Amino acid sequence: MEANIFCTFDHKLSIADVGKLTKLVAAVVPIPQRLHLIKHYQLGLHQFVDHTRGYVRLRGLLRNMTLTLMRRVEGNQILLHVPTHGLLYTVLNTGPVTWEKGDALCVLPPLFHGPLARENLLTLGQWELVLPWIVPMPLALEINQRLLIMGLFSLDRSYEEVKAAVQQLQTITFRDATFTIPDPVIDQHLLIDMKTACLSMSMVANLASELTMTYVRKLALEDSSMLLVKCQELLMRLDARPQHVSPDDEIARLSALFVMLRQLDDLIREQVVFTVCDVSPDNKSATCIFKG
Amino acid sequence: METHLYSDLAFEARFADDEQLPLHLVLDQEVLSNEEAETLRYVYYRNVDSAGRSTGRAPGGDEDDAPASDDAEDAVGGDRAFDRERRTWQRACFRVLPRPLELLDYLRQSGLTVTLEKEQRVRMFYAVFTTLGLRCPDNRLSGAQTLHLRLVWPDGSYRDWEFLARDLLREEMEAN
Amino acid sequence: DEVARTDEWKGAGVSRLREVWDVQHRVRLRVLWYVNSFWRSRELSYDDHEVELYRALDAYRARIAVEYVLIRAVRDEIYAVLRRDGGALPQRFACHVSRNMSWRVVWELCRHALALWMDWADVRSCIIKALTPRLSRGAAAAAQRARRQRERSAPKPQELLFGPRNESGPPAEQTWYADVVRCVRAQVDLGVEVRAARCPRTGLWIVRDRRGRLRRWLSQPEVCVLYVTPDLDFYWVLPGGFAVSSRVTLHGLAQRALRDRFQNFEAVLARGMHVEAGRQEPETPRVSGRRLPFD
Amino acid sequence: TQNINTVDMGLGYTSNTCVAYVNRVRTDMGVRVQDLFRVFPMNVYRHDE
Amino acid sequence: QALTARFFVPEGLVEFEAQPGALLIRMETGCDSPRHLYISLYLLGIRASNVSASTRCLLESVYTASAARAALQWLDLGPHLLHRRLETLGCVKTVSLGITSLLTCVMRGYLVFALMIPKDMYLTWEETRGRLQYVYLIIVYDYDGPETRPGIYVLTSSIAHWQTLVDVARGKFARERCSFVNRRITRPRQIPLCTGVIQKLGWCLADDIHTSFLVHKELKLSVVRLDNFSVELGDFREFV
């Protein structure tokens, strides 16, 4: 296997740039082709980033690519190391997001942040180095879910009604931080995802058993608690012995319901890339296991 | 083709609540140019009462009936009146076939077993499929009703023209 | 074991095909009837009592009436204000003038232009374009803001010294829509768009194209031209920059029909266009036949 | 591995070369026209027939 | 390096599988004495709808042993479900024949180690040869007919991220998905689980893919071959 990747800079390496790059050692950068030797253009997302077109497209392009770690550099030579599944590695936090002990990580395209004054790395000519965001599971799942919600809600509505909802949706608060999705324009990829979501939602609506349909009504009649009060408050606009009980048919129907819900979940959950051990107290670096 | 079937099922669903019956249309080069048929974005339709009304407005009357004020501040009831006007328009599904085709051969290549009164060949350089509705307040349907067909392109330009229900239903309903 | 509606639908098929023209006989299109449609099962009834038909055509006449009557109201304003002024036209558009010219012939050309323009009146004319932005939602808010901003006291020295800078005023560059008619060969132009500005030396108007080039027609003896402002103010010009001033009295029409006929239709989101308001749209979707369709 | 660093010791073009001798040609010098359909595979004529 | 494994299987199943490079699957059975039985990918071809008539005739001719026929009866007995009953072991290369045969399997390794696939079962979504390719085993369920006979494919693709592969599979298999919905509506008393199942086993260089013929008992089969192969098993993941 190509356990090492060499990249060569065509431009001259001034002392400031090489020192700055030396500070980035052991960070995470993606590489498209996995080929043994690669030019400096493909290192980073700058070749593919385009604010005019979908953030969904950039999300897909990022999730398709491969992940690598950084190594110390020398004259005109920068060394990249591909991780092997199951081993233990050291990574540095590229974004400002806080990291916590014992939760998974995901990779996502960069996000707008409070000051908007993002630091520029290795701006060699018209080319620039930009890193992907390594994000813990709740924030990444929340942002992907809310992007899908944007796509599903905004369709077939005028800009006026959409204007308040997008300002409510776009802002994400996560563990005392604030974030905003750069460019949530609808794209054909989002339409395919939405078509699959609609099919799965209708299927689970259909094949759900009677007990599952009537469960919350019976319990709301029976009990009363804050969770049930909230559920009824949600369903208020919409709002006996079962004549048939069949354990085997119920088992099969619930298995079908699980395959449907399993499919619907895959639309949201991005693939894990890292699982963490305990983190340095400065929130800048962590030691993690890599998964493929 | 699928648009006709889906719209028929959807109007079957919504008929019990708003009582619109479906009408299926096909348009060709006598309607619109190939360039604007290739970039078609939106299609809109509306129904009118015999005396002159709309589907969204209150049938008896509305403040919009008042003369225009030509004042500086609110030309014509800006926000509320514009909301009403966008309310009265309704959207319908559409599919466009940019390749040239003839109706009967295409339908027979699909599952539909067309058997017309005569096998009149029609050649269309490009075809768009669209289904529209015309409402009847109860199961009485008046031939004097007029129907609107709007087409919208990305740059905001639009073209529209009106039909008489008596022409559309001239013989199909006469049988029933 | 039962089949879905789709398969019996496709089996049953269609059997009828009719061609129908629109009311004006502008466009013809076909309609299809499916034998399996629920429309057949409902068994609804149909009638076309003649009084309802007569009411429908009269209402339709009133519907197409909206723009021609506005043109005629423009005529009435022109003639009424010409009588009221009594045959005096102040100069309003910046151009030089010659004294030793047979002004009678250019007056007769103005008469001919007035006659010719009215014969070629259409919905494509300038005033429909002038009302086009006036009807939209933004127009009312913009007019409110403009009236509030223009009706303002001069800032005290306190406000000028501290806090916000001088609040931006209106720009000189105005947008007009225009009709121009040429009498030397009887032909008219009706859908023109033009830039306007007020000359700094004298308060007369200067007319320019959107490309910035200075416009020439004002000199030509054989042409008379028509202007309308985005706040529905009206001007008619004959050679020599001498103008007639009035306001378009659109109060002759009911708001319902006026809004029904035309408005700058606002869009709703579709595949490819931005969710954020006002962003630059990507390349057009354009499901195409020139190319093998993507899948 | 062995890093090689080179330094130029002249303020001018210190090396010259010429295209000296010919071995037989690698291209046929033919007249077979480029297959334009294969370099633009997406485009089709409108009517299918 | 390689993780060797060892199985026993009766002679009736072996004779066509006896070529060193083969792929093996474990099948559960309700019958108490053969609690488990071992089936190779070729034997799935006798029932796979994708396999052409001539190759199906050859497979019917070869696997005539009573134990193999009982195995196929157990396979066909399964109501509209196979992945609940099939489990993947991996690639094999060693065999000793006899009244009860012995063969070894590798579940993780890259130590000739070519993996063999029948020519009927092989497809690619892309004609462009990407330098790095993954290969997957997929099962697809047909639903437009009276009762569900399954489809079998082994495919190579340059896509690694799962959801992108599911997107392209949905794009190419839309007919099967519509057939699944049609099955759900037309027979409401029956509840199918999925349209298809993806399972991952592959790491190989694209320049080392071969086309070849194979012989057994002087009967001739056409096959496609992956030569410089590495095996990495995965979970049976269901898609719609």
Side-chain angles (χ1 to χ4, degrees), chain A residues 28 34 65-69 81-91 107 271-276 287-292:
Chain A
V28 54
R34 178 61 85 83
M65 283 199 295
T66 80
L67 278 295
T68 71
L69 272 297
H81 177 220
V82 57
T84 48
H85 192 164
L87 277 296
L88 171 56
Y89 299 89
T90 297
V91 300
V107 63
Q271 184 158 0
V272 289
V273 292
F274 286 90
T275 296
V276 299
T287 66
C288 308
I289 313 301
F290 175 80
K291 299 192 180 185

PDB file of all heavy atoms in Angstrom, chain A residues 28 34 65-69 81-91 107 271-276 287-292:
ATOM      1  N   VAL A  28      -4.327  17.779   9.724  1.00  0.00           N
ATOM      2  CA  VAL A  28      -5.069  16.929   8.799  1.00  0.00           C
ATOM      3  C   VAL A  28      -5.325  17.691   7.504  1.00  0.00           C
ATOM      4  O   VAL A  28      -5.788  18.838   7.523  1.00  0.00           O
ATOM      5  CB  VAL A  28      -6.388  16.435   9.427  1.00  0.00           C
ATOM      6  CG1 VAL A  28      -7.225  17.600   9.932  1.00  0.00           C
ATOM      7  CG2 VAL A  28      -7.178  15.608   8.432  1.00  0.00           C
ATOM      8  N   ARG A  34      -4.529   9.899  -4.082  1.00  0.00           N
ATOM      9  CA  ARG A  34      -3.831   8.866  -3.316  1.00  0.00           C
ATOM     10  C   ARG A  34      -2.529   8.457  -4.010  1.00  0.00           C
ATOM     11  O   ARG A  34      -1.783   7.609  -3.509  1.00  0.00           O
ATOM     12  CB  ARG A  34      -4.765   7.662  -3.082  1.00  0.00           C
ATOM     13  CG  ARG A  34      -4.180   6.460  -2.343  1.00  0.00           C
ATOM     14  CD  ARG A  34      -3.722   6.817  -0.941  1.00  0.00           C
ATOM     15  NE  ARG A  34      -4.812   6.746   0.023  1.00  0.00           N
ATOM     16  CZ  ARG A  34      -5.220   5.628   0.608  1.00  0.00           C
ATOM     17  NH1 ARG A  34      -4.653   4.463   0.342  1.00  0.00           N
ATOM     18  NH2 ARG A  34      -6.223   5.680   1.480  1.00  0.00           N
ATOM     19  N   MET A  65     -13.378  12.335  -0.609  1.00  0.00           N
ATOM     20  CA  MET A  65     -11.923  12.313  -0.672  1.00  0.00           C
ATOM     21  C   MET A  65     -11.325  11.520   0.492  1.00  0.00           C
ATOM     22  O   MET A  65     -12.018  11.089   1.419  1.00  0.00           O
ATOM     23  CB  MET A  65     -11.367  13.736  -0.682  1.00  0.00           C
ATOM     24  CG  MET A  65     -11.485  14.426  -2.029  1.00  0.00           C
ATOM     25  SD  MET A  65     -10.371  15.830  -2.203  1.00  0.00           S
ATOM     26  CE  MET A  65     -11.022  16.924  -0.948  1.00  0.00           C
ATOM     27  N   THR A  66     -10.008  11.336   0.429  1.00  0.00           N
ATOM     28  CA  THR A  66      -9.248  10.578   1.412  1.00  0.00           C
ATOM     29  C   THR A  66      -8.566  11.518   2.400  1.00  0.00           C
ATOM     30  O   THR A  66      -8.332  12.692   2.106  1.00  0.00           O
ATOM     31  CB  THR A  66      -8.197   9.699   0.730  1.00  0.00           C
ATOM     32  OG1 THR A  66      -7.051  10.492   0.396  1.00  0.00           O
ATOM     33  CG2 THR A  66      -8.763   9.082  -0.538  1.00  0.00           C
ATOM     34  N   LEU A  67      -8.246  10.988   3.577  1.00  0.00           N
ATOM     35  CA  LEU A  67      -7.686  11.773   4.666  1.00  0.00           C
ATOM     36  C   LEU A  67      -6.229  11.394   4.909  1.00  0.00           C
ATOM     37  O   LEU A  67      -5.844  10.227   4.798  1.00  0.00           O
ATOM     38  CB  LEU A  67      -8.496  11.574   5.951  1.00  0.00           C
ATOM     39  CG  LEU A  67      -9.783  12.387   6.145  1.00  0.00           C
ATOM     40  CD1 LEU A  67      -9.472  13.872   6.245  1.00  0.00           C
ATOM     41  CD2 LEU A  67     -10.819  12.120   5.059  1.00  0.00           C
ATOM     42  N   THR A  68      -5.415  12.398   5.241  1.00  0.00           N
ATOM     43  CA  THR A  68      -3.995  12.200   5.503  1.00  0.00           C
ATOM     44  C   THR A  68      -3.573  13.058   6.688  1.00  0.00           C
ATOM     45  O   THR A  68      -4.261  14.014   7.057  1.00  0.00           O
ATOM     46  CB  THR A  68      -3.112  12.554   4.295  1.00  0.00           C
ATOM     47  OG1 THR A  68      -3.107  13.975   4.102  1.00  0.00           O
ATOM     48  CG2 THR A  68      -3.595  11.867   3.023  1.00  0.00           C
ATOM     49  N   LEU A  69      -2.435  12.704   7.280  1.00  0.00           N
ATOM     50  CA  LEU A  69      -1.821  13.480   8.348  1.00  0.00           C
ATOM     51  C   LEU A  69      -0.544  14.147   7.848  1.00  0.00           C
ATOM     52  O   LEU A  69       0.023  13.761   6.823  1.00  0.00           O
ATOM     53  CB  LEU A  69      -1.510  12.603   9.565  1.00  0.00           C
ATOM     54  CG  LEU A  69      -2.612  12.430  10.614  1.00  0.00           C
ATOM     55  CD1 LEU A  69      -2.954  13.774  11.242  1.00  0.00           C
ATOM     56  CD2 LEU A  69      -3.855  11.772  10.037  1.00  0.00           C
ATOM     57  N   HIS A  81       1.408  11.665   5.458  1.00  0.00           N
ATOM     58  CA  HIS A  81       1.290  10.288   5.921  1.00  0.00           C
ATOM     59  C   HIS A  81      -0.178   9.886   5.933  1.00  0.00           C
ATOM     60  O   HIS A  81      -1.004  10.557   6.562  1.00  0.00           O
ATOM     61  CB  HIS A  81       1.900  10.130   7.314  1.00  0.00           C
ATOM     62  CG  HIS A  81       1.758   8.752   7.883  1.00  0.00           C
ATOM     63  ND1 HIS A  81       1.463   8.521   9.209  1.00  0.00           N
ATOM     64  CD2 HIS A  81       1.873   7.534   7.304  1.00  0.00           C
ATOM     65  CE1 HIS A  81       1.399   7.219   9.423  1.00  0.00           C
ATOM     66  NE2 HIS A  81       1.644   6.597   8.283  1.00  0.00           N
ATOM     67  N   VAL A  82      -0.497   8.801   5.242  1.00  0.00           N
ATOM     68  CA  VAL A  82      -1.859   8.265   5.257  1.00  0.00           C
ATOM     69  C   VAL A  82      -2.022   7.370   6.484  1.00  0.00           C
ATOM     70  O   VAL A  82      -1.144   6.535   6.755  1.00  0.00           O
ATOM     71  CB  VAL A  82      -2.155   7.505   3.963  1.00  0.00           C
ATOM     72  CG1 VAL A  82      -1.156   6.375   3.743  1.00  0.00           C
ATOM     73  CG2 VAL A  82      -3.577   6.962   3.976  1.00  0.00           C
ATOM     74  N   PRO A  83      -3.088   7.534   7.264  1.00  0.00           N
ATOM     75  CA  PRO A  83      -3.269   6.682   8.442  1.00  0.00           C
ATOM     76  C   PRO A  83      -3.769   5.296   8.069  1.00  0.00           C
ATOM     77  O   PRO A  83      -4.430   5.097   7.047  1.00  0.00           O
ATOM     78  CB  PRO A  83      -4.308   7.446   9.267  1.00  0.00           C
ATOM     79  CG  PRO A  83      -5.120   8.160   8.242  1.00  0.00           C
ATOM     80  CD  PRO A  83      -4.156   8.542   7.143  1.00  0.00           C
ATOM     81  N   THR A  84      -3.441   4.330   8.922  1.00  0.00           N
ATOM     82  CA  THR A  84      -3.889   2.952   8.767  1.00  0.00           C
ATOM     83  C   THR A  84      -4.992   2.671   9.778  1.00  0.00           C
ATOM     84  O   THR A  84      -4.898   3.088  10.937  1.00  0.00           O
ATOM     85  CB  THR A  84      -2.734   1.968   8.954  1.00  0.00           C
ATOM     86  OG1 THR A  84      -2.001   2.305  10.138  1.00  0.00           O
ATOM     87  CG2 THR A  84      -1.797   2.011   7.755  1.00  0.00           C
ATOM     88  N   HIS A  85      -6.038   1.981   9.329  1.00  0.00           N
ATOM     89  CA  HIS A  85      -7.212   1.720  10.154  1.00  0.00           C
ATOM     90  C   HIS A  85      -6.833   0.987  11.435  1.00  0.00           C
ATOM     91  O   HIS A  85      -6.163  -0.050  11.395  1.00  0.00           O
ATOM     92  CB  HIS A  85      -8.226   0.902   9.350  1.00  0.00           C
ATOM     93  CG  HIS A  85      -9.582   0.818   9.980  1.00  0.00           C
ATOM     94  ND1 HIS A  85     -10.698   0.406   9.283  1.00  0.00           N
ATOM     95  CD2 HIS A  85     -10.008   1.103  11.234  1.00  0.00           C
ATOM     96  CE1 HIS A  85     -11.750   0.432  10.081  1.00  0.00           C
ATOM     97  NE2 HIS A  85     -11.358   0.852  11.271  1.00  0.00           N
ATOM     98  N   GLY A  86      -7.267   1.531  12.571  1.00  0.00           N
ATOM     99  CA  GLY A  86      -7.103   0.885  13.854  1.00  0.00           C
ATOM    100  C   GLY A  86      -5.935   1.365  14.690  1.00  0.00           C
ATOM    101  O   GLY A  86      -5.936   1.142  15.907  1.00  0.00           O
ATOM    102  N   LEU A  87      -4.944   2.019  14.089  1.00  0.00           N
ATOM    103  CA  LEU A  87      -3.781   2.462  14.841  1.00  0.00           C
ATOM    104  C   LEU A  87      -4.057   3.808  15.513  1.00  0.00           C
ATOM    105  O   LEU A  87      -5.125   4.407  15.361  1.00  0.00           O
ATOM    106  CB  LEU A  87      -2.552   2.528  13.934  1.00  0.00           C
ATOM    107  CG  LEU A  87      -1.773   1.228  13.686  1.00  0.00           C
ATOM    108  CD1 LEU A  87      -1.171   0.723  14.991  1.00  0.00           C
ATOM    109  CD2 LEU A  87      -2.612   0.137  13.024  1.00  0.00           C
ATOM    110  N   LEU A  88      -3.071   4.289  16.266  1.00  0.00           N
ATOM    111  CA  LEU A  88      -3.209   5.466  17.115  1.00  0.00           C
ATOM    112  C   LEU A  88      -2.324   6.585  16.582  1.00  0.00           C
ATOM    113  O   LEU A  88      -1.160   6.350  16.244  1.00  0.00           O
ATOM    114  CB  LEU A  88      -2.851   5.118  18.563  1.00  0.00           C
ATOM    115  CG  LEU A  88      -2.706   6.210  19.622  1.00  0.00           C
ATOM    116  CD1 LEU A  88      -3.963   7.051  19.730  1.00  0.00           C
ATOM    117  CD2 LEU A  88      -2.389   5.563  20.962  1.00  0.00           C
ATOM    118  N   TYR A  89      -2.878   7.796  16.505  1.00  0.00           N
ATOM    119  CA  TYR A  89      -2.206   8.919  15.867  1.00  0.00           C
ATOM    120  C   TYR A  89      -2.467  10.197  16.652  1.00  0.00           C
ATOM    121  O   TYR A  89      -3.362  10.251  17.499  1.00  0.00           O
ATOM    122  CB  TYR A  89      -2.678   9.111  14.418  1.00  0.00           C
ATOM    123  CG  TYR A  89      -2.413   7.929  13.515  1.00  0.00           C
ATOM    124  CD1 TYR A  89      -3.339   6.903  13.397  1.00  0.00           C
ATOM    125  CD2 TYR A  89      -1.239   7.841  12.783  1.00  0.00           C
ATOM    126  CE1 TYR A  89      -3.103   5.820  12.572  1.00  0.00           C
ATOM    127  CE2 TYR A  89      -0.993   6.762  11.956  1.00  0.00           C
ATOM    128  CZ  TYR A  89      -1.930   5.754  11.855  1.00  0.00           C
ATOM    129  OH  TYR A  89      -1.691   4.676  11.033  1.00  0.00           O
ATOM    130  N   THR A  90      -1.673  11.225  16.359  1.00  0.00           N
ATOM    131  CA  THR A  90      -1.826  12.547  16.957  1.00  0.00           C
ATOM    132  C   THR A  90      -2.319  13.534  15.905  1.00  0.00           C
ATOM    133  O   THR A  90      -1.753  13.613  14.811  1.00  0.00           O
ATOM    134  CB  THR A  90      -0.501  13.032  17.550  1.00  0.00           C
ATOM    135  OG1 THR A  90      -0.096  12.147  18.602  1.00  0.00           O
ATOM    136  CG2 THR A  90      -0.642  14.446  18.101  1.00  0.00           C
ATOM    137  N   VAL A  91      -3.372  14.282  16.239  1.00  0.00           N
ATOM    138  CA  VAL A  91      -3.961  15.267  15.338  1.00  0.00           C
ATOM    139  C   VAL A  91      -4.065  16.601  16.066  1.00  0.00           C
ATOM    140  O   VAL A  91      -4.176  16.642  17.296  1.00  0.00           O
ATOM    141  CB  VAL A  91      -5.348  14.821  14.829  1.00  0.00           C
ATOM    142  CG1 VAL A  91      -5.241  13.507  14.078  1.00  0.00           C
ATOM    143  CG2 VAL A  91      -6.327  14.695  15.984  1.00  0.00           C
ATOM    144  N   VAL A 107     -15.537  14.887   9.606  1.00  0.00           N
ATOM    145  CA  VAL A 107     -14.886  15.881   8.759  1.00  0.00           C
ATOM    146  C   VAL A 107     -15.936  16.575   7.899  1.00  0.00           C
ATOM    147  O   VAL A 107     -16.805  15.924   7.304  1.00  0.00           O
ATOM    148  CB  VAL A 107     -13.774  15.240   7.902  1.00  0.00           C
ATOM    149  CG1 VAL A 107     -14.340  14.197   6.944  1.00  0.00           C
ATOM    150  CG2 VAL A 107     -13.001  16.311   7.148  1.00  0.00           C
ATOM    151  N   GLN A 271     -19.814   9.721   8.024  1.00  0.00           N
ATOM    152  CA  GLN A 271     -18.962   8.613   8.436  1.00  0.00           C
ATOM    153  C   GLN A 271     -17.911   9.082   9.436  1.00  0.00           C
ATOM    154  O   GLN A 271     -17.301  10.142   9.262  1.00  0.00           O
ATOM    155  CB  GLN A 271     -18.290   7.983   7.218  1.00  0.00           C
ATOM    156  CG  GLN A 271     -17.446   6.760   7.537  1.00  0.00           C
ATOM    157  CD  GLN A 271     -17.230   5.871   6.330  1.00  0.00           C
ATOM    158  OE1 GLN A 271     -17.715   6.160   5.237  1.00  0.00           O
ATOM    159  NE2 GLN A 271     -16.499   4.780   6.523  1.00  0.00           N
ATOM    160  N   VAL A 272     -17.702   8.287  10.489  1.00  0.00           N
ATOM    161  CA  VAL A 272     -16.694   8.624  11.484  1.00  0.00           C
ATOM    162  C   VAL A 272     -15.300   8.485  10.879  1.00  0.00           C
ATOM    163  O   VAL A 272     -15.053   7.641  10.008  1.00  0.00           O
ATOM    164  CB  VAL A 272     -16.837   7.739  12.734  1.00  0.00           C
ATOM    165  CG1 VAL A 272     -18.081   8.120  13.512  1.00  0.00           C
ATOM    166  CG2 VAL A 272     -16.878   6.270  12.343  1.00  0.00           C
ATOM    167  N   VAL A 273     -14.378   9.328  11.343  1.00  0.00           N
ATOM    168  CA  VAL A 273     -13.000   9.288  10.867  1.00  0.00           C
ATOM    169  C   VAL A 273     -12.034   9.156  12.038  1.00  0.00           C
ATOM    170  O   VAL A 273     -10.916   8.654  11.877  1.00  0.00           O
ATOM    171  CB  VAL A 273     -12.669  10.529  10.019  1.00  0.00           C
ATOM    172  CG1 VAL A 273     -13.450  10.505   8.717  1.00  0.00           C
ATOM    173  CG2 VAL A 273     -12.976  11.797  10.794  1.00  0.00           C
ATOM    174  N   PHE A 274     -12.448   9.604  13.224  1.00  0.00           N
ATOM    175  CA  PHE A 274     -11.584   9.565  14.394  1.00  0.00           C
ATOM    176  C   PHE A 274     -12.400   9.326  15.656  1.00  0.00           C
ATOM    177  O   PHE A 274     -13.520   9.823  15.799  1.00  0.00           O
ATOM    178  CB  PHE A 274     -10.769  10.860  14.550  1.00  0.00           C
ATOM    179  CG  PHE A 274      -9.640  10.997  13.566  1.00  0.00           C
ATOM    180  CD1 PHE A 274      -9.833  11.620  12.345  1.00  0.00           C
ATOM    181  CD2 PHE A 274      -8.382  10.504  13.868  1.00  0.00           C
ATOM    182  CE1 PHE A 274      -8.794  11.745  11.442  1.00  0.00           C
ATOM    183  CE2 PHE A 274      -7.339  10.626  12.971  1.00  0.00           C
ATOM    184  CZ  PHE A 274      -7.546  11.249  11.756  1.00  0.00           C
ATOM    185  N   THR A 275     -11.817   8.552  16.570  1.00  0.00           N
ATOM    186  CA  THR A 275     -12.319   8.383  17.926  1.00  0.00           C
ATOM    187  C   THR A 275     -11.195   8.748  18.883  1.00  0.00           C
ATOM    188  O   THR A 275     -10.057   8.301  18.710  1.00  0.00           O
ATOM    189  CB  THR A 275     -12.804   6.950  18.179  1.00  0.00           C
ATOM    190  OG1 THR A 275     -13.925   6.668  17.334  1.00  0.00           O
ATOM    191  CG2 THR A 275     -13.221   6.774  19.632  1.00  0.00           C
ATOM    192  N   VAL A 276     -11.512   9.557  19.890  1.00  0.00           N
ATOM    193  CA  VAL A 276     -10.499  10.293  20.635  1.00  0.00           C
ATOM    194  C   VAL A 276     -10.195   9.602  21.956  1.00  0.00           C
ATOM    195  O   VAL A 276     -11.062   8.985  22.586  1.00  0.00           O
ATOM    196  CB  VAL A 276     -10.936  11.751  20.892  1.00  0.00           C
ATOM    197  CG1 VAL A 276     -11.149  12.482  19.583  1.00  0.00           C
ATOM    198  CG2 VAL A 276     -12.189  11.797  21.750  1.00  0.00           C
ATOM    199  N   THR A 287      -4.995  12.955  20.815  1.00  0.00           N
ATOM    200  CA  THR A 287      -4.535  11.658  20.334  1.00  0.00           C
ATOM    201  C   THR A 287      -5.753  10.801  20.027  1.00  0.00           C
ATOM    202  O   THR A 287      -6.641  10.652  20.873  1.00  0.00           O
ATOM    203  CB  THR A 287      -3.640  10.968  21.368  1.00  0.00           C
ATOM    204  OG1 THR A 287      -4.411  10.645  22.533  1.00  0.00           O
ATOM    205  CG2 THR A 287      -2.487  11.877  21.765  1.00  0.00           C
ATOM    206  N   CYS A 288      -5.797  10.237  18.821  1.00  0.00           N
ATOM    207  CA  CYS A 288      -7.029   9.642  18.328  1.00  0.00           C
ATOM    208  C   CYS A 288      -6.743   8.335  17.606  1.00  0.00           C
ATOM    209  O   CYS A 288      -5.624   8.089  17.147  1.00  0.00           O
ATOM    210  CB  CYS A 288      -7.761  10.598  17.381  1.00  0.00           C
ATOM    211  SG  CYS A 288      -8.032  12.252  18.048  1.00  0.00           S
ATOM    212  N   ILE A 289      -7.775   7.499  17.511  1.00  0.00           N
ATOM    213  CA  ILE A 289      -7.769   6.306  16.675  1.00  0.00           C
ATOM    214  C   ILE A 289      -8.420   6.662  15.348  1.00  0.00           C
ATOM    215  O   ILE A 289      -9.423   7.385  15.312  1.00  0.00           O
ATOM    216  CB  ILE A 289      -8.509   5.137  17.355  1.00  0.00           C
ATOM    217  CG1 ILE A 289      -8.065   4.988  18.810  1.00  0.00           C
ATOM    218  CG2 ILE A 289      -8.277   3.840  16.593  1.00  0.00           C
ATOM    219  CD1 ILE A 289      -6.586   4.743  18.969  1.00  0.00           C
ATOM    220  N   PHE A 290      -7.852   6.164  14.255  1.00  0.00           N
ATOM    221  CA  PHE A 290      -8.366   6.448  12.923  1.00  0.00           C
ATOM    222  C   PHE A 290      -9.215   5.288  12.423  1.00  0.00           C
ATOM    223  O   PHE A 290      -8.854   4.120  12.591  1.00  0.00           O
ATOM    224  CB  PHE A 290      -7.229   6.722  11.936  1.00  0.00           C
ATOM    225  CG  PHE A 290      -7.693   6.897  10.517  1.00  0.00           C
ATOM    226  CD1 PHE A 290      -8.227   8.102  10.093  1.00  0.00           C
ATOM    227  CD2 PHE A 290      -7.596   5.857   9.608  1.00  0.00           C
ATOM    228  CE1 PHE A 290      -8.658   8.266   8.789  1.00  0.00           C
ATOM    229  CE2 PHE A 290      -8.024   6.013   8.304  1.00  0.00           C
ATOM    230  CZ  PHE A 290      -8.555   7.219   7.894  1.00  0.00           C
ATOM    231  N   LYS A 291     -10.347   5.622  11.811  1.00  0.00           N
ATOM    232  CA  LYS A 291     -11.246   4.646  11.215  1.00  0.00           C
ATOM    233  C   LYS A 291     -11.526   5.036   9.771  1.00  0.00           C
ATOM    234  O   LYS A 291     -11.529   6.223   9.427  1.00  0.00           O
ATOM    235  CB  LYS A 291     -12.557   4.546  11.999  1.00  0.00           C
ATOM    236  CG  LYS A 291     -12.382   4.101  13.442  1.00  0.00           C
ATOM    237  CD  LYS A 291     -13.715   3.740  14.073  1.00  0.00           C
ATOM    238  CE  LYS A 291     -13.541   3.302  15.518  1.00  0.00           C
ATOM    239  NZ  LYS A 291     -14.826   2.842  16.113  1.00  0.00           N
ATOM    240  N   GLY A 292     -11.761   4.034   8.930  1.00  0.00           N
ATOM    241  CA  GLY A 292     -11.997   4.263   7.518  1.00  0.00           C
ATOM    242  C   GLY A 292     -13.409   3.933   7.076  1.00  0.00           C
ATOM    243  O   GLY A 292     -13.671   3.734   5.890  1.00  0.00           O
TER     244      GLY A 292
END
